[PDB]
């Protein structure tokens, strides 16, 4: 009866930095994934463990929409079994990921003359992230032998680092808004379905 | 258009003062961490001081803690390093670097000599 509010996610006014990705869960509604493919000309629209053409035929208990901003160079890392600072320290998808990665270039919104440095990504972590983990900690990273808890030595870094989005940047350095729809399927009944 | 330019330095004696300035072009210096490095001729490069992005703190090596102080002038887009109570081992060439982590595309130094007496 009710159509799933995809406009709230893809058409949001503000977007989160990748280290603090936003999540909105979708249920008790109906989703046409073909209407959303052509909803806007998307940079990337790929899926894993499922295929885009069949998307309306499936049915899921819950659907989670995760949104954030990264470089175009780093859309490759938003995929199962990928390595890199974004996948290791900011947003990790599991090896058995079933869902879709949708991204588009957002230079017109997120870049700015003189540079936009408001978006951040985690630069250091003592571990690689576990799937769908979200670390927004701000605590001084200690790299090397000498400790830094109060010592404040050289080899101790503030964990988050700002992106530098210039409008004249190459396409790889330009900001991309990314939406990842994870298709959770459980033993409980389904709540979201194609027509 | 991106570059860093070191100024200041020279000859001073044990107990003397000095201030080095690193003038950056092509980016605001407060958005990323800025660092000061030094390399004595025999030894390897050593990190001496660093000031994190925005107001997230300062970092000083044990070698120079309490004697050196790093600071940032957002108007002059310049990071300064004030060197007080200089000891003969502080002789080196001094370099500044941006921890841009590849968000830039840029990738000379100044000499400081401090005598004993
Ligand atoms: C994302 O938004 C675009 C258009 O942006 C605004 O959102 C609409 C709800 C409406 O307020 C527009 O006037 C705004 O400009 C959507 O594209 C529009 O889709 C509606 C669907 O009814 C259609 O009536 C308009 O003609 C479309 N306009 C354009 C320029 O394409 C798009 O569908 C939204 N994405 C979603 C909902 O997923």
Q: In terms of DSSP bridges, do strands A156-157 and A141-142 run parallel, antiparallel, or are they unpaired?
A: antiparallel
Give, for A9, the enclosing helix (H) or strand (E).
helix A7-10
CA distance A146 to B4: 29
Tell me the structure's resolution in angstroms, rounded to a single decimal: 2.9
Domain residue ranges of chain B, discontinuous segments joined by +: 1-117
Experimental method: X-ray
B97 neighbourhood in chain A, CB within 8 Å: none
Burial classification of residue B56, based on how many CB atoms lie within 10 Å of its CB (0-12 exposed, 13-18 middle, 19 or more buried): middle
| Separation CA A194–CA A58 (nearest Å) | 7
Break chain A into its structural domains and give their ranges: 1-114+167-195, 115-166
Residue A128 and residue A170: Cα distance in Å, rounded? 29
Rg (CA), chain B: 14
Closest ligand 1 atom to Cα of A11:
1
- Whole-number Å distance between alpha carbons of A30 and B102: 43
3-state secondary structure of B35: strand
Those residues of chain B whose CB sits closer than 8 Å to some CB in chain A are 27-28, 31-33, 35, 47-50, 52-53, 56-62, 99-101, 103-104
| Rounded-to-integer distance, Cα B82 and Cα A71, Å | 37
CA distance A139 to A70: 22
Encoded tokens for A121 = 């990504």
Query: Taking a C-beta distance cutoff of 8 angstroms, is the pair B51, B72 a contact?
Result: yes
């Amino acid at each position: 009866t009710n159509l799933c509010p995809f406009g709230e996610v893809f058409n949001a006014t503000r977007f989160a930095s990748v280290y603090a990705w936003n999540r909105k869960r979708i249920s008790n509604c109906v989703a046409d994934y073909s209407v959303l493919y052509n909803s806007a000309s998307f940079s990337t629209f790929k899926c894993y463990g499922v295929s885009p053409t069949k998307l309306n035929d499936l049915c899921f208990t819950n659907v989670y929409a995760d949104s954030f901003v990264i470089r175009g160079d780093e859309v490759r890392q938003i995929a199962p079994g990928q390595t890199g600072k974004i996948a290791d320290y900011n947003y990790k998808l599991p090896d058995d990921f079933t869902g879709c990665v949708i991204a588009w270039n957002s230079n017109n919104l997120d870049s700015k003359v003189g540079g936009n440095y408001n978006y951040l990504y985690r630069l250091f972590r003592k571990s690689n992230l576990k799937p769908f983990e979200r670390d927004i900690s701000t605590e001084i990273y200690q790299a090397g032998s000498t400790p830094c808890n109060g010592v404040e030595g050289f080899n101790c870094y503030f964990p988050l680092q700002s992106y530098g989005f210039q409008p004249t940047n190459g396409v790889g350095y330009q900001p991309y808004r990314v939406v990842v729809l994870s298709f959770e399927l459980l033993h409980a009944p389904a709540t979201v379905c194609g027509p | 258009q991106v570059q860093l330019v070191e100024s200041g330095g020279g000859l001073v004696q044990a107990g003397g003062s000095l201030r080095l300035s690193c003038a950056a072009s092509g980016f605001p210096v407060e958005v990323w961490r800025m660092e000061w490095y030094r390399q004595a001729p025999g030894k390897e490069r050593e990190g001496v001081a660093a000031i994190e992005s925005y107001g997230h703190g300062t970092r000083y090596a044990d070698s120079v803690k309490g004697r050196f102080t790093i600071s940032r002038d957002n108007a002059k887009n310049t990071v300064y390093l004030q060197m007080n109570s200089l000891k003969p081992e502080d002789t080196a060439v001094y370099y500044c670097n941006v921890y841009d982590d590849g968000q830039l595309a840029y990738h000379q130094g100044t000499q400081v000599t401090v005598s004993a007496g």
